[PDB]
């Protein structure tokens, strides 16, 4: 069904690198150059206070929407990814349900400024104090710490492209029907990532990459904080949360 579902040669690994980098460039949602230029555009003390004064349900809804929009670009990235559309519909859904949020969390490090510990949110850069109305400081601080540790790696766009393809194409996801097909696809993508790192003398980042349990823990904490919000405002989730968000994180 696809070349990368079997053993690939060096030349085909080289093509896979260009393919993944292209798929990512066309689906990155926000341009890195726009994110870097906006670093000086920081929310005022008055603006931060206005966000803190917002109700919990309103902040949750704003955040669920922005996350949902980011996930749509991840779905488009998956669709352009070599071998993804050749997998069955069950496996594509399994891979996106388990991995879309993890891909968004990795993509996030581009919108995060380690110099002043601020993130790009609704047109400007703000610290974690901007999300105080959410009432999930542990999850927010954990996301900020994770983006801070990824920022220290100084990832290029090509490295993000390749690493993020691997976050998504994970053959160990429970519920995969064609596990062997996913395994071979993951192997070729592992080779493509390691090949590009070898070529750019960036193999030193391999030991510095976050453990796979770190991304799973963040996702499990997200689903947990959602359930606590759901108990407090069930009609807010049912009526105002994006349908795509509920499909991935509620059930």
């Amino acid at each position: 069904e696809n070349l990368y579902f079997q053993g690939a040669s060096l030349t085909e690994i080289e093509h896979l690198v260009q393919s993944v980098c292209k798929s990512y460039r066309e689906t990155c949602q926000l341009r890195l150059e726009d994110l870097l230029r906006q670093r000086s555009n920081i929310f005022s003390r008055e603006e931060v206070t206005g966000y803190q004064r917002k109700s919990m349900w309103e902040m949750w809804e704003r955040c669920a929407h922005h996350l949902t929009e980011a996930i749509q670009y991840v779905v488009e990235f998956a669709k352009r990814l070599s071998g993804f559309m050749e997998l069955c519909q069950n496996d594509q859904i399994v891979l996106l349900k388990a991995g879309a949020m993890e891909v968004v969390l990795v993509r996030m490090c581009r919108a995060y400024n380690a110099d002043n510990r601020t993130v790009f949110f609704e047109g400007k850069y703000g610290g974690m104090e901007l999300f105080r109305a959410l009432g999930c400081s542990e999850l927010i601080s954990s996301i900020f710490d994770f983006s801070h540790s990824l920022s220290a790696l100084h990832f290029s766009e090509d490295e993000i492209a390749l690493y993020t393809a691997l976050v998504l194409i994970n053959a160990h996801r429970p519920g995969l029907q064609e596990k062997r097909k996913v395994e071979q696809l993951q192997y070729n993508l592992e080779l493509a990532f390691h090949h590009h790192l070898c070529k750019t003398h960036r193999q030193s980042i391999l030991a510095k990459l976050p453990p796979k349990g770190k991304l799973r823990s963040l996702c499990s904490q997200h689903v947990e904080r959602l359930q606590i919000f759901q108990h407090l405002h069930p009609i807010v989730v049912q009526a105002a949360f994006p349908p795509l968000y509920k499909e991935l994180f509620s059930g």
Partner: peptide
């Protein structure tokens, strides 16, 4: 259900 996800995946 996976209504939205199926639709996004099918929409070519």
């Amino acid at each position: 259900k996976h209504k939205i996800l199926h639709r996004l995946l099918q929409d070519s």
